[PDB]
Amino acid sequence: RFDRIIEVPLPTFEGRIQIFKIHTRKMKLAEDVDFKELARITEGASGADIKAICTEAGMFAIREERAKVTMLDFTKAIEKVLKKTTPIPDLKGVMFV
Amino acid sequence: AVELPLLKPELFAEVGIEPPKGVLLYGPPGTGKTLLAKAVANQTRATFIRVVGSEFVQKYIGEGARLVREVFQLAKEKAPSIIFIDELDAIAARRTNSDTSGDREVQRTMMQLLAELDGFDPRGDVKVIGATNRIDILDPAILRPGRFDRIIEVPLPTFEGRIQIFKIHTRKMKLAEDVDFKELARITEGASGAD
Amino acid sequence: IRVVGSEFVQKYIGEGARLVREVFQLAKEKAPSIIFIDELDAIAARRTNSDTSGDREVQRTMMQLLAELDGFDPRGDVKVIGATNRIDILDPAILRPG
Amino acid sequence: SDTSGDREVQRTMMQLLAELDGFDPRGDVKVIGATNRIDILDPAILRPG
Amino acid sequence: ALNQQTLAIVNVLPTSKDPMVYGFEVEEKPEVSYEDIGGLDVQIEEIRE
Amino acid sequence: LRSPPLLVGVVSDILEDGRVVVKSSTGPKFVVNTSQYINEEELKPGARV
Ligand SMILES: Nc1ncnc2c1ncn2[C@@H]1O[C@H](COP(=O)(O)OP(=O)(O)OP(=O)(O)O)[C@@H](O)[C@H]1O
Ligand SMILES: [Mg+2]
Fold this sequence. Notes:
- Chain C: It is found in: Cytoplasm.
- This is part of a larger assembly, with 6 copies of chain A.
- Chain A contains 4 helices and no strands.
- By secondary structure, chain A is mainly alpha-helical.
- The radius of gyration of chain A is 17 Å and the shape is flat.
């Protein structure tokens, strides 16, 4: 009835970066932004997530009164998005050798 | 999140800020979720469409979804517009469970909304202000960013916060020469702006 | 305006929400009016499952009367006045002072 | 029933029976049915005859 | 179409039931275009094939 | 285009003084005159006319 049954999972390391590339392109020039490094913080995120990180990275941009989106803005925005959904506890690791 | 798109788009252009597509509010009751929305309507002056997430769903099958679709298309037509939705509590269900009618007809009007904000064609100029009390019984599709980009918790005010809420009411009224707000706010800790 | 507030909530979907809406609207039109909502036991519901269909159906009717009550739409010099017998069933929304 | 289309479902079954071989001749028909799932049917239909 | 004045056919019309956006509306160019193929790239290839 | 209008009805009763009650596809019933431009044995309640 379909035949081509697709699981559309959460984007990979490489996948997430492709999405950031379109966004960064709209948010003008950069000089210290590394798309991989973004991936490592944002490890396990979705496509709509990345768009909202980008929206807030922009906001964070005008509080320093900038006309472009540098790396600090992304760091902050990633941190904000992620914040409500850390901490993830791993303090069973004091009960494991 | 809504003011800058309407008066200040030249600023979104210059930096390159992507458009937002809602801000979601939740919090304990009476904190002033309603006030935040009331201030925004009054103070951004653009099409304030006020609806209620329980006004939706009517006695004919599939009616509810039709009604929703009308609000969203009308906002698109009357853009710039802000839709203020109160109460997502009985129009969105995190569970899907079948062989029922009270939790399967409401899920097909839930599905329409997911789906009218980012519809086929994004965007409109909505900027949907969601308001609910708990997101624990809202679907994950509402809660995740890309619409409802900013997840604003609204908690119980702070100590200095509470001193300000007192002076908000006292300004309309009058008082004696013995009111120290600091001592009052201490007692009224743990309490919403309504209390 | 005297309403038995337990004879709202019909088994047909969203019809319940209709009925309470109309009575509320009349209340702003014909102001000052005192509305008596009897039994908030049965038009109130819990957010923790105890019947899948029951809690949510009732909730739509409930959140509707609440919306008119001070949700955004005018009070209309209402003035509720209402009774219930149980305070442990009450959805946090209506319960709070304000 | 909840009660817009629902009433109608029991309403149509009265017709189909009726004609099938309730009282009327049927000829070389040979009403052939099909259904998606196994048990979703009324007992009448399941019942040989 | 029937001319109401005497109630005969004066014109044959095209299809169908009544089309609104009951199968119509073509947009596929901005904002989502084929420059948004930076997915999720493998999933797009499955669709493409 | 100017029509030869004939309105479709079905026959409701037949009178034994030579008139026929036909109910219209519009809704009303009217009394009409019995054929002399066609068969009168092809008139019966339930005759499409
Ligand atoms: N932050 C505040 N500062 C000043 N007064 C407030 C504040 N919040 C609430 N109030 C007062 O309490 C009233 C009632 O609460 P309000 O309608 O603002 O609640 P809400 O958070 O939308 O609730 P619910 O969860 O029940 O839908 C206000 O109209 C105002 O008088
Ligand atoms: Mg509220």
